[PDB]
């Protein structure tokens, strides 16, 4: 099936998912000088006080921290968004080395990792219906650089031993995603896609300008995960990122001057 190897990686996905060569694929390079300030955007409203995390799952490509999305408990609104988007899961993309790992780039700079908080538009009733719409999802992307530890990440890092291999899950209740956000909500936004198969063109991307810092030790624990299932040959879960795709006929907007 698809993955991140030489024989099944990003360069191959178009064979099964022709939308890989589409008009609004993600990620992209964010050219900071060409993005334009848009005074009519909103502040973002991130309302995560009532979040209910449930579980963490190694799905063979990343790990997902899953939320109860059966009520408006953790929602994203405002900014470029019309209406209410419910948090379903977050995950990360990361590298084998601190010099790569992010999906989006900023003036061609790659960060060590990128956090994706995935939300679906409540007008479409469920995630599966939302991904079939051009405004179905809103993904909040946050860059990670290596430096100081991120305290609010530690509970995630320390459960990773229990979900080493594909298909393993663990209970993951009472996790507060607010502890993964930077101070500033300044952002760039553009219309794009999921960055993994099926690559659906359903995402309003909201990429924060300010990275969070995580420690070397924290990212090293990401890199101990496995893509494989238990009892299969070990293949470290690293470099689970798609490179930048052509911008095509899109403009990236900034919420800040
Ligand atoms: Co992602």
Curated annotation (Swiss-Prot):
The record marks 89 as: Involved in the binding of some activators, including histamine and L-histidine. One of its GO terms (molecular function) is cyanamide hydratase activity. It comes from the Eukaryota. Zinc. Can also use cobalt(II) with lower efficiency, but not copper(II), nickel(II) and manganese(II). The record marks 4, 59, 64 as: Fine-tunes the proton-transfer properties of H-64. GO terms for biological process: angiotensin-activated signaling pathway; carbon dioxide transport; morphogenesis of an epithelium; neuron cellular homeostasis; positive regulation of cellular pH reduction; positive regulation of dipeptide transmembrane transport; positive regulation of synaptic transmission, GABAergic; regulation of chloride transport. Changing residue 59 to V: Reduced activity. Optimum pH is 6-8. GO terms for cellular component: apical part of cell; cytoplasm; cytosol; extracellular exosome; myelin sheath; plasma membrane. Residues 1-256 form the Alpha-carbonic anhydrase domain. The modification Phosphoserine is found at residues 162, 169. This is Carbonic anhydrase 2. It comes from Homo sapiens.
